[PDB]
């Protein structure tokens with residue numbers, strides 16, 4: 263009875279692990295006449311409609327969303343110790359009630375509810391159920407405010423619908439930020455009016471050659487809107503001064519020798535660089551950041567800064583000193599890979615650490631020092647949360663430069679005491695980046711993202727006290743029937759006792 267269990271799954275069997283789980287009493291059972299009661303507000307009805315849409319296919323039930331009556335499933339906004347993202351979920355014969363201070367909290371409560379329901383809930387056709395929800399109370403709040411997932415649409419382009427699909431994959435685990443790597447050596451993916459060739463030429467191909475693609479301003483706005491409806495703040499990234507071949511290939515003038523390099527379709531990194539000693543370089547950067555900021559309602563703008571190996575150290579520092587202010591000029595908070603820690607991060611900046619266990623102490627120290635100086639830290643170790651990294655030497659996709667990363671390694675660590683000497687209060691959260699040098703279709707993205715994706719979400723959300731591999735692997739194993747029913751391919755790691 264893997265697909266439709268006789269009894270409801272345990273109230274605590276969800277990922278991320280909730281801050282507090284108090285099981286008790288009889289469960290709730292959704293029946294054909296169940297109504298979804300919401301507050302008389304746009305934001306409330308929005309979450310209600312979202313929930314109804316998730317349940318209607320598998321249940322076949324009408325599930326009307328109303329602001330009147332005493333519905334079996336109630337979403338209510340009220341005061342409480344749940345912050346901007348927390349919630350309380352009560353379940354019993356009298357119904358299921360999700361209470362929160364804001365819509366994001368109700369939304370997160372819904373993500374928990376879909377895991378309490380049986381795997382059959384993932385089907386597209388009416389199923390017998392039973393639609394049971396374990397009885398008891400869950401009180402849940404997040405540990406970190408920065409819980410993100412990154413998708414690389416530069417190495418291989420993924421259209422709006424494919425990005426929406428990935429957004430739905432991450433929404434399941436309460437991630438709240440979506441980092442989009444919009445430009446790199448193999449492609450420029452956002453239309454810039456002031457420099458039309460970036461998209462038309464720079465986005466004309468991708469890794470492996472052939473058609474590439476890019477988002478028009480309208481398409482980008484739609485991705486941001488969809489992400490927002492899934493409570494994901496979009497953090498766009500235009501990498502500089504390295505990983506800029508797509509731009510360089512589009513405009514000869516940006517190159518130090520005034521010659522446009524060919525479009526790049528390989529899989530190497532570190533060979534490209536904007537010309538730091540040219541004035542046009544800064545006009546270009548200002549134009550791009552300005553246009554991108556205009557399309558970004560979110561608070562952050564990622565300028566990259568990684569692997570600028572063709573940029574002399576002194577030029578890299580000079581470049582970052584000149585460009586960081588441009589982000590603030592357009593009203594945003596700058597974010598950069600941790601290499602920025604070596605180029606005097608501006609006040610309010612955040613750096614994304616992608617180092618490894620083996621990283622030299624001097625490098626770790628530079629980042630820890632930035633943290634001491636007030637720079638926020640986003641942790642995404644390449645040998646921990648890089649979803650493109652192979653599980654073992656036999657993984658058919660992905661890379662291996664950072665060694666192998668099985669499920670336990672990806673999960674078994676504590677963000678608070680990870681980077682030696684770094685103040686715990688400087689850690690803003692975590693991120694799970696999915697690079698696409700080796701991935702060209704949605705199914706391949708799933709195979710590399712799952713089952714490690716839920717684990718990184720837990721590190722960002724759950725209390726340190728709930729962290730434990732032996733018990734976590736059981737909660738992860740329980741996801742198998744849900745993913746199978748949902749058509750989500752995943753690596754069946756031998757470290758996990760799959761249900």
Ligand SMILES: CC(=O)N[C@H]1NC[C@H](CO)[C@H](O)[C@@H]1O
Nearest residue numbers: 531568569599616650661697
């Ligand atoms: C910050 C960063 O990660 N830069 C590069 N490092 C290796 C990756 C592959 O695992 C991608 O090539 C990525 O663009």
Ligand SMILES: [Cl-]
Nearest residue numbers: 427430431748
């Ligand atoms: Cl999904």
Ligand SMILES: [Cl-]
Nearest residue numbers: 527528529530
């Ligand atoms: Cl090459």
Ligand SMILES: [Cl-]
Nearest residue numbers: 529530531532
């Ligand atoms: Cl390389």
